[PDB]
């Protein structure tokens, strides 16, 4: 779930803030309220 490609150059830094998310390279900013990437995790590993 990397913030993928339309305008920036790099990995878009984490939301991790109060405002909407820029880039470092070109500065193309996008809405902080877009991402809903839902993560799943570990499992049966204990017997």
């Amino acid at each position: 779930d990397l913030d993928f490609c339309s305008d920036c150059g790099s990995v878009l830094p984490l939301p991790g803030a109060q405002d909407t998310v820029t880039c470092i390279r070109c500065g193309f900013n996008i809405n902080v309220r877009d991402f809903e990437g839902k993560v799943v995790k570990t499992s049966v590993v204990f017997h």
Binding site: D1, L2, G9, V11, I24
Partner: protein, 732 residues
């Protein structure tokens, strides 16, 4: 295989009583002679072509003062067969070894160099320097006995059946022993607790790789695996271990904007949701420090390291970074993009390990262990030692502005070239003792007992002494039995009854009788096209079925693409054909191992090829095509080998061992009725027989050796094993 097409069928004595006993033959014996192909073959290739590609990597060096860019370099260097200092009138200005033994002196060589005196850019001079001497392995392409027939031998009073391969330092005969080091250019997994404690958040896991170049110096890699989620690189240069996260390397390598990196280092496990997060996390924690573009990260790394790397304070901060990068990371490749893909495949394996999809490949078998020849050690010691001569000439030139004398710019070359930095002493030392007084471990972990004096008290002593791998003197005080118990795979590449019981028991093995180390390099020229003009898809193309199921195809240090589920066995069989028929530049020395996907924790899947030197290999017969075939250590584990004819089952088996006698070494093949005996007796005798006292040798006037035990009236023994003749032992 054709070499063993003439074994005797039951010995005889017809040959002790013929009119021809006594008159020297013309073609000296074949087998006995090739019994030491490896030693002289390597040293052969060393000095005639090895320091060819091994002087074209010493860095241009001299920088002394006055804004000068003098960069004097070696154009060529060579060695010439050993002649005599000009005698009063020496009739023949050549020296033969038999002379060197009598007078307790060495058997040397002549070293020459071509330095170009580029005066801040090529201006002046190419001065030849007489560096020093070097010893010469007898009967290489550098000793006067090169290519002589037997009579020309006995007239020189050297014994008729010479095999050579030793050096002569003051009469003694020293031999370099073959050691063992891991596989060449391979990502071998590993687990170990001792790693845990080097810093914070180290797990036990990781991968490894031993990388060696043409100009044979070596480097050792390591990628740990953090629990946090990041992956590191832990290498060492010039005796100090270094630290570097993965982000800096995968940015500094190729400009190649990162989403490339992510989408490529993620091959088809898209379902994961911790892997990709760890990936993105790396990519961020490398971005927000001081750097955005490629030159930027280079700038940063150089600014950090040029304090330790000790480059000239002339150069910019990025040049030193780049200099460092391609001197200690994935050397064998000599490019960048392939350095990238190598790092990629390494980490993919490391992950699929730590998550537990594969099985931890043993780093202790013979499936992952090969052999160092004396040529390697020799050449690499030499190439290290040249640098020291350059830097010493530097201080020799600095003594000028130090003594505040005339710090000259040119026409002082001759004088400033005699410092007293010769190469005699450092080489006489390495052999005189066996010690390795040096500055680089050259991949090795030890430095002593490297060449030990071959005795002459018998003929069995010699005939073994030249066929003896050993695993390094450091593994002796250890108590674990796992370093001695014969793994069931070493069948055919080591001898089970020949270990020298005592203190260095179990380790100081000897080779089998049907294995030959590989020492002829090939032109790796047209094989990738050959791969790709079949099913193999290009490396970064659009692979028609490119996802979780597809095999990488490494090539002795080169990614070449991917193959899919249907093809891999078809490709492996086709290359089987095109080796055995020996058709199109496909060497016979080649291994074609494909490891299928078990769906279960097992060996890492793949399909691997090699051509590199220094590997064990032994012939077998094929039941598909009549011809005989060569098998590498790695690809026995997936073959069916029928020992006797009575076993051969149609459709399931493929090979047929040549003769059953293979398993044993040669010495342990001179024992009679040896499957009846009990094993510890076999071993006791293979130790004993070397101790005995029989007919050592003919010329009792050549050698002033110290102790020669002789037995007046020896006799041929009546009950004999076939291989007593095939080596014509009866002369001794």
């Amino acid at each position: 295989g054709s070499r063993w097409r003439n074994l005797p069928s039951g010995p005889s004595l017809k040959h002790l009583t013929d009119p021809s006993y006594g008159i020297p033959r013309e073609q000296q014996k074949a087998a006995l002679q090739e019994l030491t192909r490896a030693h002289v073959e390597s040293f052969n290739y060393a000095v005639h072509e090895g320091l060819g590609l091994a002087v074209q990597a010493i860095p241009p060096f001299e920088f002394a003062f006055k804004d000068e860019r003098i960069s004097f370099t070696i154009l060529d260097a060579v060695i010439s067969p050993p002649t005599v200092p000009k005698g009063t009138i020496c009739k023949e200005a050549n020296v033969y070894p038999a002379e060197c033994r009598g007078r307790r002196s060495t058997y040397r060589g002549k070293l020459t160099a071509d330095i170009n005196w580029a005066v801040n850019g090529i201006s002046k001079g190419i001065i030849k320097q007489f560096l020093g001497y070097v010893p010469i392995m007898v009967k290489s392409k550098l000793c006067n006995l090169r290519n002589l027939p037997p009579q020309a031998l006995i007239e020189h009073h050297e014994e008729a059946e010479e095999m050579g391969g030793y050096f002569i330092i003051n009469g003694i005969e020293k031999v370099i022993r073959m050691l063992i080091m891991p596989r060449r250019n391979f990502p071998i997994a590993m687990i170990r607790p001792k790693w845990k404690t080097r810093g914070p958040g180290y797990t036990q896991y990781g991968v490894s790789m031993h990388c060696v170049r043409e100009e044979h110096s070596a480097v050792n890699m390591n990628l740990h695996y953090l629990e946090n989620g990041t992956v590191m690189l832990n290498f060492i240069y010039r005796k100090e271990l270094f630290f570097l996260p993965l982000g800096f390397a995968l940015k500094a390598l190729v400009s190649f904007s990162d989403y490339q990196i992510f989408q490529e280092l993620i091959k088809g496990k898209e379902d994961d949701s911790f892997l990709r997060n760890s990936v993105s996390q790396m990519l961020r924690i490398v971005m927000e420090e001081g750097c955005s573009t490629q030159k930027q990260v280079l700038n940063y790394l150089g600014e950090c390291f040029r304090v330790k790397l000790n480059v000239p304070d002339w150069y910019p901060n990025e040049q030193a970074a780049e200099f460092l990068f391609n001197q200690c990371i994935c050397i064998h490749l000599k490019s960048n993009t392939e350095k990238f893909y190598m790092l990629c495949l390494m980490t993919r394996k490391l992950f699929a390990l730590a998550k537990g999809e594969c099985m931890e490949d043993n780093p202790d078998s013979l499936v992952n262990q090969e052999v160092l020849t004396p040529g390697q050690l020799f050449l690499m010691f030499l190439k290290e030692k040249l640098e020291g001569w350059l830097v010493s000439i530097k201080i020799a030139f600095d003594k000028k502005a130090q003594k505040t004398s005339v710090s000259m710019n040119t026409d002082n070359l001759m004088r400033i070239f005699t410092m007293g930095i010769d190469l005699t002493k450092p080489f006489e030392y390495l052999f005189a003792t066996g010690n390795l007084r040096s500055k680089t471990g050259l991949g090795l972990l030890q430095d002593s007992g490297l060449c030990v004096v071959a005795d002459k008290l018998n003929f069995i002593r010699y005939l073994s002494h030249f066929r003896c791998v050993h695993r390094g003197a450091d593994f002796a005080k250890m108590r674990t039995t796992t370093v001695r118990r014969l793994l069931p795979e070493s069948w055919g590449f080591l001898c089970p009854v020949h270990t020298p019981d005592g203190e260095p028991c179990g380790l100081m093995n000897h080779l089998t009788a049907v294995c030959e180390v590989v020492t002829q390099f090939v032109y790796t020229a047209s094989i990738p096209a050959l791969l790709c003009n079949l099913g193999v898809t290009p490396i970064d193309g659009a692979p028609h079925r490119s996802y979780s199921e597809c095999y990488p195809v490494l090539l002795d240090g080169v990614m070449v693409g991917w193959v899919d589920k249907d093809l891999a066995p078809g490709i492996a069989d086709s290359l089987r054909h095109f080796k055995v028929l020996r058709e199109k530049r496909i060497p016979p020395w080649m291994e074609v191992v494909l490891i299928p996907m078990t769906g279960k924790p097992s060996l890492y899947p793949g399909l691997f090829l090699f051509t590199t030197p220094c590997r064990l290999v032994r012939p077998v017969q094929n039941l598909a095509l009549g011809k005989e075939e060569l098998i590498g250590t790695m690809e026995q584990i997936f073959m069916n080998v029928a020992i006797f004819e009575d076993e051969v089952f149609a459709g399931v088996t493929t090979h047929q061992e040549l003769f059953p006698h293979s398993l044993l070494s040669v010495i342990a093949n001179f024992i009679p009725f040896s499957d009846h005996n009990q094993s510890p007796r076999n071993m006791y005798q293979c130790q004993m027989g070397k101790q005995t006292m029989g007919f050592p040798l003919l010329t009792y006037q050549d050698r002033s050796d110290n102790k020669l035990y002789r037995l007046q009236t020896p006799q041929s023994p009546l009950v004999r094993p076939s291989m007593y003749d095939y080596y014509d032992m009866d002369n001794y």
